[PDB]
C-alpha cells in the first residue's frame, strides 16, 4: 500500500529543450524559486545567479552520464561567493501531512563537470533536500552524499508521522537547495519522487 504523492514537473521535463546543453534561466514550471537571501534576481540572464532546466543530451560537454530521468535536469547556479547564503527550488504540494505515515522523498543530485573556454565547472557547492509540512522542515538530507564530477546520486529523505504530529493536515512541501559552500557553485536536481505509506 505504497502511495505516490503527485509532484508538478517532478522531472523538470517542462519546458522541452531541443539542443543539447541548452538551458533556461527562469524558474521551472510548477516550481517556485526558494530565495531566502535574495541571491537570485527576479529577472535573470546568463550572467546572473539563476535557475531553470537543462537538456542533458548525447553530446553533452558537461556530464559523464545522461539525465537521471527523461531529457532534462533542474539546475541552480549562484554567482555570489561561498558563504553568501542559499537558494533553490521549492514546491508546495496539494497533499497534507497524514498521521501514522512513512514518507520517502527521493531526488537525484548532480555535479556539473568539465570546462568551457576558461569557465571551470570543477567543484560542488553542496546540496540539501528537505521535506516540509507548512513552514516546518520535517526532515532533510544536508549534503550527506559525495557526488563525483559529472555524475548523479539519489538523495533519500524520510519522515514518519505519529497520530499526534503538530503539523498534521498542513500542506506538504519540497525544497531543493544549493548550499553555496564552495566552487563551482552550480548543481542539478532530477527525478523528484515522494511516496507515502501507512506504518
Instruction: Write phi, then psi, for 63 (nearest 5 degrees).
Output: -130, 160
Binding status of residue 140 toward a copy of itself by CB under 8 A? yes
Binding status of residue 142 toward a copy of itself by CB under 8 A? yes
Question: Mask 26-65, x = binds Ca ion (CB under 5 A)?
Answer: ----------------------------------------
Residues 180-199 that bind Ca ion (CB under 5 A): 184, 190
Is beta strand 72-77 parallel, antiparallel or unpaired with respect to 171-178?
A: unpaired
Place of cell 564552495: 182
The least distance separating a copy of itself from the CB of residue 27, rounded to whole angstroms, comes to: 25
Question: Residue 99 has what DSSP assignment?
Answer: S
Grid cell digits, residue 74? 533542474
Binding status of residue 194 toward a copy of itself by CB under 8 A? no
Q: Alpha helix locations (H) across 5-134?
A: none
The least distance separating a copy of itself from the CB of residue 76, rounded to whole angstroms, comes to: 18
**Nearest CA-CA partner of 123 in 90, 69, 78:** 78
Residues in contact with Ca ion by CB under 5 A are 11, 67, 69-70, 72, 111-112, 121, 149, 184, 190
Amino acid at each position: 500500500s505504497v502511495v505516490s504523492i503527485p509532484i508538478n514537473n517532478a522531472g523538470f521535463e517542462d519546458p522541452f529543450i531541443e539542443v543539447v546543453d541548452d538551458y533556461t534561466v527562469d524558474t521551472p514550471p510548477g516550481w517556485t524559486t526558494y530565495n531566502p537571501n535574495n541571491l537570485v534576481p527576479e529577472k535573470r540572464t546568463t550572467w546572473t545567479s539563476n535557475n531553470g532546466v537543462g537538456y542533458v543530451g548525447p553530446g553533452t560537454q558537461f556530464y559523464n552520464q545522461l539525465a537521471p530521468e527523461g531529457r532534462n535536469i533542474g539546475y541552480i547556479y549562484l554567482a555570489q561567493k561561498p558563504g553568501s547564503g542559499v537558494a533553490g527550488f521549492e514546491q508546495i504540494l496539494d497533499a497534507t501531512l497524514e498521521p501514522d505515515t512513512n514518507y520517502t522523498l527521493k531526488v537525484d543530485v548532480g555535479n556539473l563537470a568539465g570546462t568551457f573556454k576558461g569557465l571551470s565547472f570543477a567543484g560542488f557547492p553542496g546540496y540539501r533536500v528537505e521535506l516540509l509540512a507548512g513552514d516546518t522542515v520535517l526532515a532533510a538530507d544536508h549534503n550527506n552524499l559525495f557526488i563525483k564530477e559529472g555524475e548523479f546520486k539519489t538523495s533519500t529523505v524520510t519522515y514518519t508521522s505519529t497520530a499526534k504530529d503538530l503539523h498534521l493536515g498542513q500542506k506538504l512541501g519540497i525544497r531543493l537547495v544549493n548550499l553555496l559552500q564552495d566552487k563551482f557553485s552550480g548543481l542539478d536536481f532530477d527525478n523528484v519522487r515522494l511516496t507515502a505509506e501507512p506504518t
